[PDB]
Design a protein around this ligand. Structure first.
Ligand code: EZL
Ligand code: ZN
Length: 259
C-alpha cells in the first residue's frame, strides 16, 4: 500500500498490509463489556496532575486535530491507577464520526459515543524520549474520555474556534495557555487494560485508562470538528470524519474496573 488512512482502500481493514502487528494480541481499541470487567480495589487512585500544563501548538495532521505540551519537567503528569509511577503528558487528540451514532474508538457494551478524546502520556522515568517510549513496553499511558452531545461546554470554545485556523492537513498554529483540566469529567472512575496505539505503528506499548463518565459538548461544537479536512490546501476537499479504528479482539486480556 502507499499510505495509511481511513478511506476504503487505505483504512483500518488494510493497515495489516504495512503494519502486521495490526493482527497482534494486545490491539486497541476494544469493546468494554461492563459486567466482565474485573473489579480491582488494589488500584491506587488516579491523579491527572495538570496544574502547570503549558500548551504549545494545535495541529491538523490529516488524521486528527492535536495539541502538544512542553514535557521538560515532570510538571504535568498522570500517576496512580495501574501506573507503577508518573507519566509525562505529551499531547491530546480526538476521534469522531459522521453522525451522532458513531465516532469513539472504545465501545461500552456495544455502544459508541460521538467522539473520544485521548490524552497521551509517556514514561520519562524509564525512557529518554517520547518516540522511544511510544513503541516500548510500558512506554505509554493513554487516558480516554468519551463525549456525548448535550448542553454547551465553555472552556471548550477556545479549542473549538481554533479549528478554523487548522482546517487543512499540514497546518499548525500556536496554542498557548490551554489547560486540559477543563476536558476532564468530575468522576475519576475508569477501566484499564494493556493495549496498543490505535493508529500506526500500532505498537503494543499502551496502558489504557478509559474514564467511565463522559463530558458534554453541543451539537454545534461537535460540528466544528466535522469541518476539518483530511486533505491539504492543494487537493480536493474531503472532510475529516470517521477517523476511528473499530474494536479489536481481546484475546484473553483482563479489563480491570476501579468501581
Ligand atoms: C511516535 C509515534 O507516536 C504515535 C503514533 C501513533 C499514536 N496513536 C495514538 S492513540 N489514538 O492515542 O492510541 S498516540 C500515538 C502516538
Ligand atoms: Zn487516539
Amino acid at each position: 500500500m502507499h499510505g495509511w488512512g481511513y478511506g476504503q482502500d487505505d483504512g483500518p481493514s488494510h493497515w495489516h498490509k504495512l503494519y502486521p502487528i495490526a493482527q497482534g494480541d494486545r490491539q486497541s481499541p476494544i469493546n468494554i463489556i461492563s459486567s466482565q470487567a474485573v473489579y480491582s480495589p488494589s488500584l491506587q487512585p488516579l491523579e491527572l496532575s495538570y496544574e502547570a500544563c503549558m500548551s504549545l501548538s494545535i495541529t491538523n495532521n490529516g488524521h486528527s486535530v492535536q495539541v502538544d505540551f512542553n514535557d521538560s519537567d515532570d510538571r504535568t503528569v498522570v500517576t496512580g491507577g495501574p501506573l507503577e509511577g508518573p507519566y509525562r503528558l505529551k499531547q491530546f487528540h480526538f476521534h469522531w464520526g459522521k453522525k451522532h451514532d458513531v465516532g469513539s474508538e472504545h465501545t461500552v457494551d456495544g455502544k459508541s459515543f460521538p467522539s473520544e478524546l485521548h490524552l497521551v502520556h509517556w514514561n520519562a522515568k524509564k525512557y529518554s524520549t517520547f518516540g522511544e517510549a511510544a513503541s516500548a513496553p510500558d512506554g505509554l499511558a493513554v487516558v480516554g474520555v468519551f463525549l456525548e452531545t448535550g448542553d454547551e461546554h465553555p472552556s471548550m470554545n477556545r479549542l473549538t474556534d481554533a479549528l478554523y485556523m487548522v482546517r487543512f492537513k499540514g497546518t499548525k498554529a500556536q496554542f498557548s495557555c490551554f489547560n486540559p483540566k477543563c476536558l476532564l469529567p468530575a468522576s475519576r472512575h475508569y477501566w484499564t487494560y494493556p493495549g496498543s496505539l490505535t493508529t500506526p505503528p500500532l505498537s503494543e506499548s499502551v496502558t489504557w485508562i478509559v474514564l467511565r463518565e463522559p463530558i458534554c459538548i453541543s451539537e454545534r461544537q461537535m460540528g466544528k470538528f466535522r469541518s476539518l479536512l483530511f486533505t491539504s490546501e492543494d487537493d480536493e476537499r474531503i472532510h475529516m470524519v470517521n477517523n476511528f479504528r473499530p474494536p479489536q479482539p481481546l484475546k484473553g486480556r483482563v479489563v480491570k474496573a476501579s468501581f
